[PDB]
């Protein structure tokens, strides 16, 4: 059971309104704990988790410093890529980046990564070897060349193996009774008549963490998944997640069907039916 510390960067040139907006969010597993937004009254790194609110001015003053550093790097990079692709001056483009590390049960770095994208399409990416680069197009190749000469990949794997692993290791400590939890799904079934004369069975799953889950409607062991209706897992905005799936069923047959819930927090999978 591995854990992970990840960061997400975003820059958007906004002609018609103002200057480029920069947004930085940090995640430990499926829980954001930190935030920076350059559209704030006075942009600074802020906690988004109760277990981060005791770090002290030391940490936050330093994190803000780095966040502002990247806000400036990014609005400079925004202009640079426009020149690479030979695009118009007052355009609206996006640059986003994700870096971080997966650290597994023993303490070992499982995988380190750092990839970015220009306007929703891949740009340059650090390979898993933490030594080479993949360039999606010609412009990324330009950037790659400038980074291979500057030996920039070496500074990356330095971070991804040291600072990243260590601070993740202590972020886990600060929020151990919240990050190492495993709240199981609380499932139930609802019944909803259709105009067609049949009914809809909907199986909910509520208040579970982490987010990865599976719902499957059954008929005594047999599946009905490619005539079903799924819904992508959504945040309840409280630290847990929700999801449901539905099937159409002829009137009267309601109790004949069972929905199978699969999640980590459960000892063994659920099987909810209409009651």
């Amino acid at each position: 059971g591995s854990h992970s510390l990840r960061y997400f960067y975003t820059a958007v040139s906004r002609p018609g309104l103002g200057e480029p907006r920069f947004i930085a969010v940090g995640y430990v597993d499926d829980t954001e704990f930190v935030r920076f937004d350059s559209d704030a009254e006075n942009p600074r790194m802020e906690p988004r988790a109760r277990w981060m609110e005791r770090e002290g001015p030391e940490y936050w003053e330093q994190q803000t410093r780095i966040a502002k550093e990247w806000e400036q790097i990014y609005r400079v990079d925004l202009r640079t890529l426009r020149g690479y692709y030979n695009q118009s001056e007052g355009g609206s483009h996006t640059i986003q980046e994700m870096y971080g590390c997966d650290v597994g049960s023993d303490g070992s770095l499982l995988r380190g990564y750092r990839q970015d994208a220009y306007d929703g399409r891949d740009y340059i990416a650090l390979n898993e070897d933490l030594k080479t680069w993949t360039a999606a197009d010609f412009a990324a190749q330009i950037t790659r060349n400038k980074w291979e000469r500057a030996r920039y990949a070496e500074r990356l794997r330095a971070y991804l193996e040291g600072t990243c692993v260590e601070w993740l290791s202590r972020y886990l400590e600060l929020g151990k009774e919240t990050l190492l939890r495993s709240d199981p799904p609380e499932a139930h079934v609802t019944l909803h008549p259709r105009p067609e004369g049949d009914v809809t069975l909907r199986c909910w799953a509520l208040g579970f963490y982490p987010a990865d889950i599976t719902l499957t409607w059954q008929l005594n062991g047999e599946d009905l998944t490619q005539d079903m209706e799924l819904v992508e897992t959504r945040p309840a905005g409280d630290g847990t997640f929700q999801k449901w799936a539905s099937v159409v069923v002829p009137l009267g047959k309601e109790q004949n069907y069972t929905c199978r819930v699969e999640h980590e927090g459960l000892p063994k999978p659920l099987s909810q039916r209409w009651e």
Binding site: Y7, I66, I73, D77
Partner: peptide, 12 residues
């Protein structure tokens, strides 16, 4: 902790 160095530039 956010990544930093930053004298290596890190400009694209």
């Amino acid at each position: 902790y956010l990544r930093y160095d930053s004298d290596v530039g890190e400009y694209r």
